[PDB]
Structure formats: C-alpha cells, structure tokens
Amino acid sequence: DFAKLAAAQGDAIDSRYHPSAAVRRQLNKVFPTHWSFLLGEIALYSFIILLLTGVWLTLFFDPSMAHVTYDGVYQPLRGVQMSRAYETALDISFEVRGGLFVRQVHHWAALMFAASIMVHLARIFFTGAFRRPREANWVIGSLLLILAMFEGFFGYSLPDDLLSGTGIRAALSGITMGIPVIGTWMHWALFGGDFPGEILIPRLYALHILLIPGIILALIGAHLALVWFQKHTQFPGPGRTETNVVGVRVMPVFAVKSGAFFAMITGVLGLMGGLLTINPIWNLGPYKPSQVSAGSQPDFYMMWTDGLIRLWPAWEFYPFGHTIPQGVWVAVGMGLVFALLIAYPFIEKKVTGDDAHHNLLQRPRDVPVRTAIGSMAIALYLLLTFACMNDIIALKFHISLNATTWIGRIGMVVLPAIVYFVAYRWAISLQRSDREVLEHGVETGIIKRLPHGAYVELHQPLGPVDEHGHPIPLEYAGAPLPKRMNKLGSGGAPGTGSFLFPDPAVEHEALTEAAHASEHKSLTALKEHQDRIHG
Amino acid sequence: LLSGTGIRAALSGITMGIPVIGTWMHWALFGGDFPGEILIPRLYALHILLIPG
Amino acid sequence: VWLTLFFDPSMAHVTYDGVYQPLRGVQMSRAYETALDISFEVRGGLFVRQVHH
Amino acid sequence: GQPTDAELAEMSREELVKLGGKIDGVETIFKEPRWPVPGTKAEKRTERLVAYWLMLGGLSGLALLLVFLFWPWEYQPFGSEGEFLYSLATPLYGLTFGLSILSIGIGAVLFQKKFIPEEISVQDRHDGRSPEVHRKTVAANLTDALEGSTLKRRKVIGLSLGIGLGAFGAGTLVAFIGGLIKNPWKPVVPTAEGKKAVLWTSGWTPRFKGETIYLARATGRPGESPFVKMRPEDIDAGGMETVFPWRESDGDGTTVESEHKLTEIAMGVRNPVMLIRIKPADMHRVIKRKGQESFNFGELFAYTKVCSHLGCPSSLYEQQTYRILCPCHQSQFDALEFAKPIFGPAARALAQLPITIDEDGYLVANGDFVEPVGPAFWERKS
Amino acid sequence: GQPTDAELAEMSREELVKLGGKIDGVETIFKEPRWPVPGTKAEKRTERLVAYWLMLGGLSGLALLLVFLFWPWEYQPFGSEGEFLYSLATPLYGLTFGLSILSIGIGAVLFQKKFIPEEISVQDRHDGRSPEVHRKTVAANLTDALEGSTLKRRKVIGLSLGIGLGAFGAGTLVAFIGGLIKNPWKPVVPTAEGKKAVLWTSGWTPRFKGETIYLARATGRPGESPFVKMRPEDIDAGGMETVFPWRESDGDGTTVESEHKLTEIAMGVRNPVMLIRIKPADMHRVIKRKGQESFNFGELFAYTKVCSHLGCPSSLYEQQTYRILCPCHQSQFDALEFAKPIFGPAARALAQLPITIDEDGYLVANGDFVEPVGPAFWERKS
Ligand SMILES: CC(C)=CCC/C(C)=C/CC/C(C)=C/CC/C(C)=C/CC/C(C)=C/CC/C(C)=C/CC/C(C)=C/CC/C(C)=C/CC/C(C)=C/CC1=C(C)C(=O)c2ccccc2C1=O
Ligand SMILES: CC(C)=CCC/C(C)=C/CC/C(C)=C/CC/C(C)=C/CC/C(C)=C\CC/C(C)=C/CC/C(C)=C/CC/C(C)=C/CC/C(C)=C/CC1=C(C)C(=O)c2ccccc2C1=O
C-alpha cells in the first residue's frame, strides 16, 4: 500500500517537524520558463558531475613529486623517471577499469563548467540581471568564475605532465617571480623553495580537492539561495511586471524539467568522455625542465591569460638595480580584468544613474551601450584566446607565427573597437526592426493591387486596425515581436495522425479543436491577468 | 610505526578475516596486499574531503 | 587546512635527509617525511599538528 | 478572508491547490491537461514514444553494465591483437553511460512537454523593502541589543576588546602564514664563493674553484648512464644538443648515491643548456656581448635553454636563421648575435655559458653564467 | 490586533522590541539591567575587571606574535646550546595563543554575566502537526502534482521509467566500484610452482626450485648492505634475531637495482621471521607439529613474526619461558612446542620456517612455510 505508506510518512514528518508551510512555499515558488535561464543550471550540473567524478579520481590519485620508474603496463613509458602523481594518473588511465573514462568525463565536465559559467555570465550581463537587487549575486558569481578558472588550472596541473608542467612553470613560477616587491617571496612561499619544490603538487591537490571546491560550494550555495529568495528575474511579457513572477511552479513542471535537463547534461558529458579524447597525458611524458612541446597551451578558460602573455609587447622596466619583467604587465592586466568584472554593476550604476529596483530583464538590443561593451569584451577575450592558440593556428592554417602574433597585438586594440561599433549599431537596428514591426505589422507575401500595378507586401497588423487599412501602431513593451507569420496563427495544422499513416478524422478534429481551445484559453488567461494588473 | 601497526591490526586483519568477502574488501581498500602503494593517498582523500564533507 | 598545505600523502620511499638527526638516512614514506617536516622544518607546524590532534 | 477552520474537509484538491497558491502569493492561471480528449490514439502514440525513450535509456544502462564488466579493457601493447578492442573500450563505456542517462532525460522532458499539464502560474513578488513593521522591529531589536549591552558606554571595554581581537587576529594570521613564508635569499646552495642563494646558482655554478663541469649529453637511456661526456666533434655545423652540468663525481646512475645527483641534474630548472654549432660560413655574422666575447669555443655556442621570459625552455632552434624560438610564448632569440630577443615577450638575452675543452678533448664549461640564467625577477641586473 | 500602520513611528525601542517578540511568539520577561544604580564604584570595578581580561588577551596575542616572529625555533640536535629554547618554543606558541583567546573569551563571558541585561524570555513553541490548513494544502499540492502529471495511468511509462532508472543506477554503481574491486586470488607472484596468489606467497617462497634464501640479519645500517648473511654461531642460547629472506641476487643496497629488492624484502608483510635459539637444557621440552618435526636446525627454530591473529609482529620474546608475545593484543605463543597460542586472541600457531645451513655454514631456509603465514582468512586450511 504505497499510498498508505506515503500518507503515514507525511504525517510522521509533519508531526516530528512542521515543514508543511515551508514545503508548500518551495513547491509553489514560480520560476520563469525562459531557456536562457537554464544556462546557470548547466554550470551547476557540470559542477555536480565534477564533484562526483573527482571523488572517484581522488580514490586512485597520489599527489607527489617522489621520483619513480613507471614499471606499469604502458610500454612507451617504461623505466622513465616520473613523479608519483604522473604514475598514478597513468594508473588511473590504464590500470583501473574505467579510470580513463572517469578522468576524461571529469576534464570534460571541467571544460563544460567553465564554458557554461561564461555563457551564464554573458546571459546575465547582456540581460541586465545584475542591477539593483542582484549586484551582490553578480559579485559572488564573478568570484565563482575566477575560482573555477584557477581550480581548472590546478586540476589539469595535478597530474605532473609535460604540458601542464611547462604551463605551470610559465604562468605560476614566472609571473610570480616577476611581481616587483614580493614576487620572489610569493614564489618561495607557494613552492616552498625553487620552482620544482617537492610540495607543489601536494599543495595543489589540497587546494583543488578540498579548499577551492569548498569555497566554490559555499559560494554556489549562496548563489542559489539568493536566486531562490530574490525571486528569479524575467523578461518583459504579457502578464510579467516588476512585482510578479510568471512561469511554472517548482513541483509539477520546473522540478521535472530541471531534473531531466540535469540527466541530459550528464549524458552529453558522458558521451564526450567516451567519444572525445581529453588530455591524453600518456602521450605527454613526465614533466622535465628540459623537455618541451610546440603546443604548450592551457585549457580554454586560461587561454585568454596565456594569450595576454603572448601578445603583450615585451615591455620591461629596470629601476635602480632592479627589474620589472613582462610578467608583471600580465599580472596587472588580470587584476584589472577581474576588478572590472567584479565591479561592473557598480560601475554601470555610477555611469548611468540607475538605482531603481529592477526585476524585468532588458533585451540586449534594448540596452545598446551595454550590449556593445559586452560584445567588445567578448571580442577581446576571443582575440586573446586565439592568440594563445596562435601557435596551432599558424601551424594548421598557414599563417606566419609572427603574423599571428602581430595580428593579435593590433587587433586587441582594433577588433574591440570594430566590434563595439558594429554591436552598438546592430542593437539600434534591431530596435528599429522591432519598431517597424510595431508600426506596420508582420511581413508576408506580395500582392499586386487590382486597379493599378502597385505591389504591397500584405502585412499583418499586431494590434487594432484603424478604420482604413493602416493599423494603429502599438507601444513597445520590452518583449520580442513575432516577425514571421510562421510563429503566429498561420500554417500550423498538419494532419495529426502519425509520420507514416493518418488517424481517424473524428480523432484529428477532436484533437485539433482541443488544442485550439487550450491555446486560446492560455492567451485569454494571460490577457485577463495583464488587464487586471492595471485595469 | 604506531599508527601503521594499528592499521595493520584493524584495517587489514579485521577486513581480511570477514568470511564471504573479507579478502575482497581488503584488496579493494588497499589496492592489493596490505602495504599497497595507495592506502595513504586513499585515506588522505577520505580524511580531508570525503568523510569531513 | 594548514596541515594539508604541508602534508604529502604517499608511500614513495625516501631517505629523510632532513633536520631531525635521530632519523637520518632511514627509509621512510613521503607521508612520514612530510609529517616530520611539519613538526620540525615548518614554523609552528608542530604546534598546529598538536592542536589538530 | 478566513483560515477555513472546517471547510478544508469538503474543499476539493483543486480548491486546496488554489488556496495554497493564494497563501503563497501564487495564482495558477490556465493549468490545463495535455490530453483533454480521451481515447485518442495520438495519446497512445506519445505514451509509446516516451516509453521507447525510457526503455532505450534502460537498455543503454544495461549495456553499460554488460560492457563494463565484460569487455577487453586493459592496455594492449602497440600492434597487438586486442588493441582495437582496447581502443574502443573506453568509448563504449562513455557511449553506453551517456546514451542511457541522455535517453532517460529525453523521456523525462517528453513526459513534461506532452503529459504533465501546462500552467502559466504567476507568483506575487514581494521583493525589496520589507514592510515598515518588520524593518523597524528588526532595527529596534538590534539597537536594544547593542545599547542594553551597555557597549558604547564602557569606553575601556570598547577599546580593550578591539585591542584584544586585533592582537589575537594579528598573532593568529602571522602564525598561520609564517610557516609558508620563506626567505628566497637565504644562502643555501654551496659555491666556490661560499653559500649563495638558489636563484643566483644553477647546476653550472662551480661548487669548488676550478671544478670541471662537463657539458654531458643526456642520452635517453632509462636510468643508467643518463648523462655521458661530450666532445666538440660530436656536433656538426647547424646542430643543437641539450647538455647538462655533469661532474665526474656524478657518475653513472648505477649506484644509489648516484641517480639522485643525476636526477637533480635532470630536474634542475636552470641546468639544461643548448650547445649549437654555428656554421663556419655564418661565423662572420656573430655579434658578441660584453664579457662574453671569448665564451664561445670556436664555433660552439652554449646558451641556456630556459627562456629569459617566464623560464620555459627555448628549445626550438632554427638553423639557416639561427633563431632560438620558445614554444610557450613564441619568442625568438638571435643566436648569431648574443642570444638577444628579436621577437616575442622576451626582453633579455639568454645567458651564454662559457665553454672550452678539457684534457681528452671533452667539452667542459669554462666558468659560470655572468648573469642569473632563469627568468628575470625583482632583484636582478645589479 | 493590527499591524500598526503608523503607530510604529511613535513606538519606542522597548515597545518595538515587545512587538517583535509578540510577532515571533516570544515574550521577554524580566529584561533588567545589571547596574540599575548609577555612579557606584562596584560597577567601575567590574568594568575594569572585564577590561583587564580583554587587555590580558590582547597582551597575550601580541606575545604570540612576537614569540612566533622572534624565538629560537628550529630543531637542535641534542645536548646543544639552544636545545632548551627549542624544547619550549612550541609550548610558548601554544601558551601565548591559548591564553590570548581564552582571556578574550573570559572577558566576553564576564561582560555577558555582568553588564548585558538579564532576561528570561520565553518563546511559544509551535512544534508538531502544522495546522490543518497547511497540512491539507501541502497534501493537495503534492497529490495534484502526482495525479495531474498523469503518472499512475501510463503503466508503460511507470514501468519503463523504473526500469531505466534502475538499469542506469546499476550500470553507474558497478562502473564506479568496479575500478576498486580486485580478485585477491589473481596469480601474480611468480613461484617454482607457477604464479600464485599474494596471500599464498611470501618472501620465503622459492621463486625457482632449489633456490637459496638466506636468513639475513637486518643490520640498522642506513641503506647500504641492510641485510647480511647469518650463521648459527651468531645467536647464543636464549637468543632471538629478526631475519629476512635474502637472496644472493638481492645484493647490498649500493646499486639502484638493489635497494629496491632490499626495500621489498624489508617491507614484506609476511617476510620477517624470528630465529630463536632454544636453550639445550630446555630442548627436551620441545613438542613439534605435524610435518614440522625436521624444520628446526638443531636448537634453532624459525617462526614467522607476523602474529597469527591480525598480523602484527609477535616480536616480544621471553626466554626461560619461551613465550612469543604479540604487543598489539597480548597473545602468547609457546615457542617450545610448535608456536601454538597459549593465551590471547590468537588461535592458530605461528608458521614455522624450515631452516638449515648451506655450504660455509650460513643459515638458509630449507623450504617454505607449509601453511599460509599471515593472519587467517576465509580461504584457508585447505
Ligand atoms: C590572434 C589571431 C586571431 C591571429 C590571426 C590568426 C587567425 C585565426 C587567422 C584566421 C584563420 C583562418 C580563418 C584561415 C583561413 C584562411 C583565411 C584567413 C581566409 C580569409 C578569412 C575570411 C574573412 C573568410 C571569409 C569567410 C569566413 C568567415 C571564413 C572562416 C573560415 C573558418 C576557419 C571558420 C572557423 C573558424 C576556426 C575554427 C578557426 C581556427 C580556430 C581554432 C582555434 C581551431 C582549433 C582546432 C585545431 C587547430 C585542430 O587542429 C583540430 C583538429 C581536430 C579536431 C578539432 C580541431 C580544433 O578545434
Ligand atoms: C569603481 C566602483 C564603483 C567599484 C565598486 C566597489 C566594489 C569593488 C564593490 C564589490 C566589493 C567586493 C569585491 C568585496 C569582496 C567580496 C569577497 C572577496 C567576498 C569573499 C568571497 C569568499 C567567501 C571567499 C574568497 C574567494 C576568493 C579567492 C575571492 C577573490 C577572487 C580573486 C579576485 C582572485 C584573484 C587572483 C589573482 C590573479 C590575484 C593576483 C595575485 C598574483 C599576481 C598572483 C600570482 C599569479 C598566480 C598565483 C597564478 O596562478 C597565475 C595564473 C595564470 C596567470 C597569472 C598568474 C599570476 O600572476
């Protein structure tokens, strides 16, 4: 009697505790059903998969520089001195059932985590979800992005590899020693000595499996709690206002679709871990200061920092008996990048004057200057990433390596400007298109007038039509406009039988008019609620 | 010496004496015989992240 | 957290060659070696591990 | 406007759901089932579709279990029967797992989009500026806690608590971080000129005056005799060889005392050097640095491999251009001239090792680098 | 019974605190200040007392800082000038830190107990069985979510989702734990009788038929020649020596190839053995096991050190009692008889190594243990 068991368990729960009101509030919480609001969930799900795979990895990983000869199964690396970290990474890859798959899905989850964090940041920035109520949310999310970047750095640096080791040597060691007053001291504190200090990988292992994941988990908890209680913002729409949330309740629909989305994201990541090879360390010999490779790139989320290193033009200053190497330039650049990213909402409000409580998102077209600035920043980030990749770009796409370096150097001040101008004008022209639709109706096929030979596109008005043909223009309300009669009530009733065979006409008619009734009922309910809010 | 002797007693002997799956639990925890080269890394994971979490 | 910043979990055998004279040239694991390093060659490391225990 | 003391008994499920929405500030508008018409076969087809997706997920999960437990996993040497099975083993694990969970997710999404009823529930958002009753009551509670405590009236306690907390925090933070803080300039590395700091000294620093440091070539032999003495004749015009600072005392790796000295030589960050043979025809284009004019032994030039910018090895030697390129950040150093950077982030030249030949003709270092060799840092160029 | 729309403006702090308590179900009774009478000098003394405690905390925190920054820390070898300072270095760190924070805590407690007003606030506890409105509305919401979803009507979906989730769960859990699972009976250790399991084989198992396995004494020499061949004359009546299975191929630890075989010998769990010289007077009290009657060489008996119960070494030896005691759990084995347990948790006798002397008189195992030597397990005694 599962129904009786459920009832008895509910009564016992509500007697021991009293979660009825709280649970009802959680279940009844309404979440907007916009697709772009799942971008953060992608990052959350990738993070969960990262935790689950990282536990498995830590069950088999040994962090240490203790030198050992492999003497494993992988023949191409036998008798070669390597760190125990590399040896156990190879053991995970080869000598544990499914360890290669687990580590590959872990790395793919890391890449998807960074990518989805970037996409979510783009969504919120361009939609203006950081304004008065949620600047703190933006700030903690920026800290979260920085932590994710650096944890991925430490994660692919954990198995001491040739690629990851040379990346560490460059970024960490060089840029740390570069810092003027405390650079060498920071280097010695972090590595416990010179660069190959025998505590580096244990320290990174701790930072990567316990410390940084703990901070990220706490910050994700704060992030999700803030989103939960500062009810999720929404785009302007029929019944959507600054003081309501139009969407679906948590329990019946949102919970089911979020769980299913998590399942599908897990499936995508597992499929990638299977079919796509990620970081094949066995091809990469154990780290040695002398051995190198041509590629020498970090993961894509640090590729922009590496590209900054490459592109910045070797400007070194030599104060009285001292040196200020080119690494400090990039250190300051990264500092500026993070500072501006964290402080943008406050910069935005200082610049514009907006101190209003904003609960309705802005369309990126509707906010041109911010959209232009975001496009400019994305262009700069892409230029830096492809500059880091300039080695492989030059190799495959036959471009001189010097040519790619200087393309990056010039474009990091030219391409941002071009993209800013283009994005600003593009946003304004999207606004112009929206107003054209508002004032003339949707466009359709052309018709030749009866008496004379005029051609008229035979538009379709979206609002009340004047006594004559031309309609009364509507007022823009911040919501997208249907520019195709495709997406309106036109040409949308295929035979509802099946792909290969029809259904009885009675069934088809019943279904089609039932759907018509349901959709017009939804439209009428939204219209009535909209009229009720002010009217 | 002290703590490794304690491990050898409890974790190894007790685990490996269990009738149906004792040796199987021992080998799966230690990655093989008692002094298996993964015991302390596994305990480190368990002790800094997994169990404290 | 402080201890993890200095501890190295591994059975990888090493001769101490550290500061504690009574154990010098003796085969030991990296775990033991770094615990000794915390005790002796890290300022306040002995205190931190003792207050931890 | 009443809590429905006894009407809940006869209130139906729909009425109770509406009441809950009302209490929570949620008004459910157009909660309509997906299949109002009963008995239609489109409903059965959609049912079968979601069932097929869920069953595909289950079959793929069973496939994951069967392949995981029973498949030729385990590395297979090159060109051996079973290599193909091993190569597509992990792909099969990932394919089965991902397909299973993805199909389950697709089935769940289809159930939500086809069977779970459609709603446009609208929740009243009470964001911002809690009602004045709550605000003023919280303010009163906090202010009463602060003032009643009699703080901001015991000046001595106010200052003493601040001093105590500040001193304790200072002591605790300093004791937390002093374990990590180390002096980079503590003289530790022994040298002919007494113990010196690590950054100044590399494997090429003479431990005692007049020590012989051979430019030993690092044969890839796994462990035994990894470094072997080198002769000028071994290199030929337009050739580069990575050499290391090997000492007679640092004999082959057969012993245990050795194979730690050799490991230290191999792992020395500032140790590896590139010995390049400048072509005799191109020897006339060489421009030499101050104090490094006699460093080259005839047409042999020894430059540190460590890039002068962030310290990656600069191994990519290009002959017929005499350019030592670094792969980490694409910086070229003109080997013909003193190895000065003529492109890329680097701004300082690579340190040039003084080389010569000892008795028996083997290549040896004729001294130490006249400058620190790794990447630059604050305490440099003086 | 009204929310005080505009009364809050003139409501005082006490009234607002009472209102908040009322809203939260909290009635603050007897919230009285500690010092109603003003100007008294007992108040000043108590103020100064808490101030003194906080100032002691601050002074001790500064002491922690100064001691940590400037104290003769670092190990001092032994009987060395500075050894006394080092010995109380860490105690001083702990003393200063603990005293500082303890004094801060004492000051805070005294401030709470002497200056913060005393209250006996009583909160209304609404535990158990949320009001029927909430219970029934939650039940209605959950039941509407379940039934409206149309589940428990699509038997094909109900069963397919269960099958899919179960199959995926089982694929995933098996694929998680399967990496860890290893057959303890995979024949891996080579032996004269082919590869055998690790539990069956020890360091005393002859790798090839007729192999010589000397009972090498483990000298404490740090690294070089750790194991040295042994002779019966070395022990004297009532003597115990820990010996290991040393092969001629496992030469001294000078080479890298050696010092790994030797480390394996030292770290072998089942390798160490105790060789006991039974006193000739007491040789007549010896009882011998089935198949172990000729194992002893004259008055030499070689018993495994690993205790038969949980595998700790049984290193303690009592002569004139001939009792091999295990420190882990206080189990004694009668060495005179076959090393059968005559006390403690152990129930199986220690395995007896056959021993003899080869040419030159060096002690060598005359075979292998006729039983598994470590602690017992399921697959044993057959
Ligand atoms: C710092 C910086 C950006 C310097 C400039 C270097 C650079 C990126 C130059 C452009 C590269 C191109 C597009 C070369 C083709 C020749 C060329 C320049 C034609 C004119 C360009 C132009 C305006 C054309 C008009 C039409 C048009 C837009 C054509 C674009 C054609 C292309 C290539 C579109 C895709 C863009 C693309 C993928 C560029 C390469 C970028 C990267 C990082 C690829 C990474 C990558 C590589 C490198 C693999 O080898 C690989 C092997 C197996 C699986 C996966 C991959 C993989 O993902
Ligand atoms: C103008 C205007 C109106 C401004 C608005 C005012 C404003 C700023 C309002 C917001 C207020 C803010 C930001 C408050 C603080 C928020 C905060 C920190 C809350 C606590 C968060 C929490 C719970 C835990 C802490 C998490 C955490 C680590 C947060 C900080 C995240 C950041 C900024 C990390 C930066 C890391 C970084 C690069 C530091 C520079 C130090 C250097 C140069 C180290 C050397 C170095 C290393 C070590 C590398 O690994 C590396 C790798 C690749 C390339 C280069 C380098 C490199 O140079």
Ligand SMILES: CC(C)=CCC/C(C)=C\CC/C(C)=C/CC/C(C)=C/CC/C(C)=C/CC/C(C)=C/CC/C(C)=C/CC/C(C)=C/CC/C(C)=C\CC1=C(C)C(=O)c2ccccc2C1=O
């Ligand atoms: C060889 C080898 C070892 C292979 C294995 C690889 C490995 C090591 C690890 C991965 C293996 C595993 C365990 C994979 C499965 C992972 C997993 C649990 C998937 C669940 C997805 C699934 C099976 C769905 C079935 C379809 C279905 C009926 C769905 C409806 C019922 C379900 C499952 C609902 C789940 C809801 C859900 C995702 C809850 C997450 C809980 C968390 C952390 C946060 C909740 C939460 C969410 C989700 C928000 O979006 C949100 C947005 C704004 C503000 C706040 C929140 C918020 O608090």
Ligand SMILES: CCCCCCCCCCCCCCCC(=O)O[C@H](COC(=O)CCCCCCC[C@@H](C)CCCCCCCCC)COP(=O)(O)O[C@H]1[C@H](O)[C@H](O)[C@H](O)[C@@H](O)[C@@H]1O
């Ligand atoms: C994390 C790991 C989790 C575990 C997952 C993995 C577990 C897999 C276990 C199954 C694998 C196969 C078992 C192998 C090993 C095995 O178990 O032995 C068998 C035993 O079957 C029998 O007859 C026993 C029944 C007869 C006696 C009746 C006894 C009743 C007892 C059990 C009642 C007490 C229970 C109390 C519980 C107390 C709990 C304490 C908390 C017989 O030997 P066999 O299968 O031929 O294996 C040979 C080796 O015996 C051979 O020494 C070797 O040489 C090889 O040849 C090998 O192949």
Ligand SMILES: CCCCCCCCCCCCCCCC(=O)O[C@H](COC(=O)CCCCCCC[C@@H](C)CCCCCCCCC)COP(=O)(O)O[C@H]1[C@H](O)[C@H](O)[C@H](O)[C@@H](O)[C@@H]1O
């Ligand atoms: C407000 C606090 C005021 C105090 C300022 C403290 C900074 C001045 C240091 C004074 C001590 C220096 C002289 C005697 C000591 C000396 O010569 O040591 C030096 C290194 O100084 C040390 O001791 C440790 C330095 C202390 C860490 C300070 C942390 C930063 C502070 C300033 C921030 C927290 C304060 C609160 C403000 C923030 C509030 C929060 C908002 C070099 O070490 P070395 O010669 O290589 O030996 C190594 C051994 O030190 C090493 O501990 C050992 O572990 C080895 O690794 C070893 O090699």
Ligand SMILES: CCCCCCCCCCCCCCCC(=O)O[C@H](COC(=O)CCCCCCC[C@@H](C)CCCCCCCCC)COP(=O)(O)O[C@H]1[C@H](O)[C@H](O)[C@H](O)[C@@H](O)[C@@H]1O
């Ligand atoms: C419902 C699931 C039904 C499936 C039952 C699974 C148990 C039967 C195993 C069938 C495979 C055995 C024959 C082929 C395979 C074979 O011979 O391998 C053996 C070991 O079997 C393995 O493979 C891994 C065993 C699988 C783990 C199963 C985990 C427990 C399950 C039963 C519980 C989860 C299921 C869901 C129920 C719970 C729901 C939650 C409420 C011995 O390994 P070995 O010869 O030493 O080599 C080592 C390599 O295995 C090793 O992976 C490698 O990592 C090395 O370390 C290597 O040395």
Ligand SMILES: CCCCCCCC/C=C\CCCCCCCC(=O)OC[C@H](COP(=O)(O)OCCN)OC(=O)CCCCCCCCCCCCCCC
């Ligand atoms: C990849 C790209 C790089 C990354 C880009 C992200 C960084 C943030 C982006 C842009 C910031 C600069 C915006 C442009 C600032 C406008 C200047 C001005 O002249 O002020 C006029 C305003 C309107 O006044 P109005 O009554 O609307 O009348 C209309 C009058 N014509 O005045 C004000 O309130 C504001 C006065 C001063 C505001 C200070 C803002 C900057 C604060 C420092 C933060 C760092 C800045 C980094 C810059 C890159």
Ligand code: HEM
């Ligand atoms: C939170 C975000 C995380 C990110 C972005 C991340 C990223 C990465 C990446 C990219 C790798 C390289 C894997 C490879 O090269 O095969 C890695 C390795 C590793 N990760 Fe993480 N990780 C995260 C969380 C975790 C957690 C929570 C744990 C522990 C529970 C963990 C444990 C490990 C271990 C042990 C390794 C080394 C395994 C190996 O070398 O193959 N990671 N990480």
Ligand code: FES
């Ligand atoms: S690391 Fe060599 S040029 Fe930058």
Ligand code: FES
């Ligand atoms: S360990 Fe020897 S008696 Fe228990």
